[PDB]
Amino acid sequence: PRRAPAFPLSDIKAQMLFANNIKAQQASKRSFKEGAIETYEGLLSVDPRFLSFKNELSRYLTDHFPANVDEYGRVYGNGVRTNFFGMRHMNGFPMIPATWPLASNLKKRADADLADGPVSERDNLLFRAAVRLMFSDLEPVPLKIRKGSSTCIPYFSNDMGTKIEIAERALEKAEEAGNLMLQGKFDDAYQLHQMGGAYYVVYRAQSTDAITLDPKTGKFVSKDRMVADFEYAVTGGEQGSLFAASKDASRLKEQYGIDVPDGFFCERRRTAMGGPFALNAPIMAVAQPVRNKIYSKYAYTFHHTTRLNKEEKVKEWSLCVATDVSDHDTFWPGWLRDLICDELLNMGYAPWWVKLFETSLKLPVYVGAPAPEQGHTLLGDPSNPDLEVGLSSGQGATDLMGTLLMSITYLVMQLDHTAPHLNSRIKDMPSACRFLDSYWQGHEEIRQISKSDDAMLGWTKGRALVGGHRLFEMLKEGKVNPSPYMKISYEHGGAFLGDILLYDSRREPGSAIFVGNINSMLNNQFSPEYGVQSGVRDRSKRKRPFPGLAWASMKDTYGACPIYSDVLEAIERCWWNAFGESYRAYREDMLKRDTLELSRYVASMARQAGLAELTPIDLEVLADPNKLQYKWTQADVSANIHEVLMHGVSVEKTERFLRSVMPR
Ligand SMILES: [Mg+2]
């Protein structure tokens, strides 16, 4: 059922993805790379004292603070959901091999018994109403670009000036490029305007992953992560194999001379993709206004800031169901891309723009280096984009694509299992739009708070409440999938956007509180995804610009965890044992140094201004801007801080572009 074409790097089709410059050529050829990360300035992730610390701390905390999660996956008591062994990884050393990305998810979806389109006309109206509400009366804003981000295919530039020029040129030529694609001239659109080509596959670390201690043997066991070989990926699973990657770290002693303590493993590696910037720029120019609309008009469902902001909504509910989605991005349906595109056309969106958007979700993928002596292969033909990878992580609107799919999926689940009395309100497009507009503002007896694959579903008092409890029971039993669209289950230890919903003895939302996840504090402080990048002089371009700043926001972020004080004391005691130093004093020094360094980047900040005007969100984001790509948005960050991390194309150029895309 159609194998995807594959081209080696030597092939002209793969060569055309890389411009005639050192950076692009190095990206094409980059071999498998691994090595210890610089966790903090002058500290490697594999430092024997650091690993000794992780061994003592993970064992102590698991022993003294076992998980408090009930039969229904509700967190209570200590606010702990699993053991603390997740920190036991040799950061910077990946599992081998990493997965080859699936070229087609059609078989994957069919085999999981998931629908190949909207099941009913009601569902079709609801998905289409989501498009109408999300993409209608948008306001133009500057096109914001992350500083130090790559333009990927074909230039691989990290220079802001070059990136601004590429983005402005893309907005000027998007119409001509989209019209060429409408004629089936994909090679012309790419050759002339760099719109097309492929996604560039980067493998990112998921620094912490499940590890258990087998009581029978006293040996640690790492969670098996299934990977697809090349044959499996190209055939959509028809041929080839799906097998457990090797997380065994014993190899590091032989290969690198690194002492590996017992129960330490190689990190989970996830596929991530970088989009061709010229194609993403016209998409981002529409995506940002869409986010501004949904986070303002539909703030109830979509705009999530603090633990208290989430708590205020959830406390009003009689039932709160914390859902889990299996492998969201790989299962994301291509029929939804086509439905969205068809609906945008119906709304009066420029057909050339819709074509660029459609093409961004069918694009070939260039596989770099999943393992030593593997990769350097283009999957799919750029002359006719026809892949079904699901949702590409570097597509200009991935957050919105996952949010659109999931918000409707959850609403459909509430309608099907709890609220058949609301079906009469969804008769046609105008009534579907009115209903959805009301539901998204939190005006119905059925409610939700969601972001991509994370959500909490709510029921107030009323007719749907009894159904709500049956649905929760069906999820606990876990024998029947409640959705025809995605694989849905309940979360083992219900949390929403990093905050754990801590229930008391009553196990009711009205007396439950949102608290910071103490395990995430440990993940962020002792298992960062990236090194400090001490060699990158411009800190705003680093993956972790100001790591020291996270110490200042720690009490605000995690202070509400029942075991906060206990964890900090355990850290202090273990760090003294391992380094013969005070961890608290070490972090206070790093905080001071990073605070001083920050003023160099903020125009409004004098030589030694201090953190006085900054919010806890500002500080968490400056230590980890990745939180701005999954947890928060632009409006949540102080304006002067957002400027440290992002730069924009003028609203004059985007305003003109937006006028040409949008209906009449
Ligand atoms: Mg969740």
Binding-site sequence positions for Mg(2+):
453, 490, 494
Cα-based angle 183, 189, 191 (whole degrees, multiple of 5): 140
- Number of Cβ atoms within 10 Å of the Cβ of 31: 11
List C-alpha distances in Å: 232 to 3, 241, 242, 275, 512: 10, 5, 7, 23, 45
Distance CA 451, CA 660 (A): 30
Q: Which of 641, 511, 497, 618 is nearest to 556 (CA)?
A: 618
Chain-centre distance for alpha carbon 518: 20
Pairing of strands 454-459, 38-40: unpaired
User: In the structure encoding, which two tokens stand for residue 608, read together?
Assistant: 């030694």
Q: Find the 454 Cα to ligand 1 centroid distance in Å.
A: 4
- 64: part of which helix (H) or strand (E)? helix 48-64
CB-based burial, 352-384: b 16+ in 10 Å, e otherwise: bbbbbbbbbbbbbbbbbbbbeebbbbbbbbbee
The answer to whether 99 and 228 have CB atoms below 8 angstroms apart is yes
Cα-based angle 74, 79, 84 (whole degrees, multiple of 5): 110
Written as one string, the DSSP assignment of 173-230 is HHHHHHHHHHTT-HHHHHHHH---S-EEEEEEEE----EEE-TTT--EEEPP-EEE-H
Resolution in A: 3.4
- 595: part of which helix (H) or strand (E)? helix 583-598
- Residue 639 has, within 13 A of its CA and on its CB side, a CA count of 1
User: In the structure encoding, which two tokens stand for residue 190, read together?
Assistant: 């790419």
DSSP letter, residue 70: -
Using DSSP's 3-state secondary structure scheme, residue 347 falls into helix
User: In the structure encoding, which two tokens stand for residue 448, read together?
Assistant: 């939700």
Using DSSP's 3-state secondary structure scheme, residue 428 falls into coil
The answer to whether 360 and 395 have CB atoms below 8 angstroms apart is yes
Chain-centre distance for alpha carbon 58: 26
Q: Find the 21 Cα to ligand 1 centroid distance in Å.
A: 43
What is the layout of strands, in order, in the sheet containing 319-325?
446-451, 454-459, 319-325, 488-490
Pairing of strands 377-379, 365-367: antiparallel
Q: Which of 96, 100, 401 is nearest to 250 (CA)?
A: 96
Distance CA 357, CA 136 (A): 16
The answer to whether 196 and 170 have CB atoms below 8 angstroms apart is no
Beta bridge partners of residue 388, listed in sequence order = 104
Give the relative orientation of helices 351-360 and 160-182 as an angle to the nearest 10 degrees: 110
User: In the structure encoding, which two tokens stand for residue 386, read together?
Assistant: 């026809």
Give the relative orientation of helices 651-661 and 277-296 as an angle to the nearest 10 degrees: 90
Distance CA 325, CA 510 (A): 25
Q: Which of 146, 140, 196, 136 is nearest to 170 (CA)?
A: 196
Q: Find the 386 Cα to ligand 1 centroid distance in Å.
A: 32
Enumerate long-range contacts of 576-581, CB under 8 Å, 24 or more apart.
Answer: 577/52, 577/53, 577/56, 578/49, 578/50, 578/52, 578/53, 578/56, 579/49, 579/53
Domain spanning 277-332+398-517: which CATH class is it, in words?
A: alpha beta
Distance CA 330, CA 505 (A): 38
User: In the structure encoding, which two tokens stand for residue 632, read together?
Assistant: 């928060």
- Residue 56 has, within 13 A of its CA and on its CB side, a CA count of 16
The answer to whether 284 and 143 have CB atoms below 8 angstroms apart is yes
- 496: part of which helix (H) or strand (E)? strand 495-496
Q: Find the 14 Cα to ligand 1 centroid distance in Å.
A: 39
Q: Find the 146 Cα to ligand 1 centroid distance in Å.
A: 27
Distance CA 249, CA 34 (A): 12
User: In the structure encoding, which two tokens stand for residue 128, read together?
Assistant: 């289409």
- Four-CA torsion 535, 536, 542, 544, nearest 10 degrees: 30
Place of tokens 């680093």: 542
User: In the structure encoding, which two tokens stand for residue 192, read together?
Assistant: 């002339």
φ, ψ of residue 136 in degrees (nearest 5): -75, -90
State the amino acid at position 159 in one-letter form: D
Cα-based angle 611, 614, 619 (whole degrees, multiple of 5): 85
The answer to whether 267 and 206 have CB atoms below 8 angstroms apart is yes
Give the relative orientation of helices 398-417 and 121-135 as an angle to the nearest 10 degrees: 140
φ, ψ of residue 451 in degrees (nearest 5): -155, 115
Chain-centre distance for alpha carbon 377: 25
User: In the structure encoding, which two tokens stand for residue 474, read together?
Assistant: 């069906």
φ, ψ of residue 469 in degrees (nearest 5): -65, -35
DSSP letter, residue 96: B
- Residue 347 has, within 13 A of its CA and on its CB side, a CA count of 26
Q: Find the 325 Cα to ligand 1 centroid distance in Å.
A: 9
Domain spanning 607-664: which CATH class is it, in words?
A: special
Q: Which of 355, 362, 416, 346 is nearest to 115 (CA)?
A: 416
DSSP letter, residue 8: E
The answer to whether 81 and 519 have CB atoms below 8 angstroms apart is yes
Q: Find the 451 Cα to ligand 1 centroid distance in Å.
A: 9
Distance CA 622, CA 539 (A): 10
Q: Find the 660 Cα to ligand 1 centroid distance in Å.
A: 39
Q: Which of 263, 256, 177, 164 is nearest to 213 (CA)?
A: 263
The answer to whether 513 and 495 have CB atoms below 8 angstroms apart is no
Q: Find the 516 Cα to ligand 1 centroid distance in Å.
A: 13
Identify whether 154 is preceded by a cis peptide bond (ω within 30 of 0).
yes
Distance CA 514, CA 497 (A): 10
- Number of Cβ atoms within 10 Å of the Cβ of 239: 11
Backbone torsion region of residue 450, taken as left when φ is above 0, otherwise alpha when ψ lies between -120 and 50, otherwise beta: beta
DSSP alpha helices (H): ranges in 443-563?
465-477, 518-526, 550-558
Q: Which of 465, 627, 409, 625 is nearest to 533 (CA)?
A: 625
Instruction: Give the residue extent of every domain in the chain.
Output: 1-30+102-276+333-397, 37-91+518-606, 277-332+398-517, 607-664
Chain-centre distance for alpha carbon 421: 35
Q: Find the 493 Cα to ligand 1 centroid distance in Å.
A: 8
The answer to whether 544 and 624 have CB atoms below 8 angstroms apart is yes
User: In the structure encoding, which two tokens stand for residue 38, read together?
Assistant: 């610089």
Distance CA 100, CA 273 (A): 12
Residue 100 CB partners (closer than 8 Å, separation 6+): 227, 228, 229, 230, 232, 233, 234, 367, 370, 379
Distance CA 307, CA 272 (A): 29
The answer to whether 544 and 532 have CB atoms below 8 angstroms apart is yes
- Number of Cβ atoms within 10 Å of the Cβ of 434: 13
DSSP alpha helices (H): ranges in 65-209?
106-111, 121-135, 160-182, 186-193
Classify residue 615 as exposed, middle or buried by CB count within 10 Å of its CB (0-12, 13-18, 19+).
middle
Please, what sign has the CA dihedral across residues 653, 657, 660, 662?
negative
- 277: part of which helix (H) or strand (E)? helix 277-296
The answer to whether 626 and 543 have CB atoms below 8 angstroms apart is yes
- Residue 67 has, within 13 A of its CA and on its CB side, a CA count of 17
Q: Rg of the chain over CA atoms, in angstroms?
A: 25
State the amino acid at position 330 in one-letter form: T
The answer to whether 358 and 401 have CB atoms below 8 angstroms apart is no
Q: Which of 31, 28, 271 is nearest to 153 (CA)?
A: 28
Q: Let me know if the fold of 37-91+518-606 is the same as that of 607-664.
A: no
Chain-centre distance for alpha carbon 316: 28
Binding-site sequence positions:
453, 490, 494
CB-based burial, 461-492: b 16+ in 10 Å, e otherwise: ebebbebbeebbeebeeeeebbbbbbbbebbb
The answer to whether 37 and 92 have CB atoms below 8 angstroms apart is yes
Q: Find the 402 Cα to ligand 1 centroid distance in Å.
A: 14
Classify residue 581 as exposed, middle or buried by CB count within 10 Å of its CB (0-12, 13-18, 19+).
exposed
Q: Find the 336 Cα to ligand 1 centroid distance in Å.
A: 23
- Number of Cβ atoms within 10 Å of the Cβ of 523: 17
| CATH-assigned architecture of domain 37-91+518-606 | Orthogonal Bundle (1.10)
Q: Find the 9 Cα to ligand 1 centroid distance in Å.
A: 40
Distance CA 646, CA 540 (A): 9
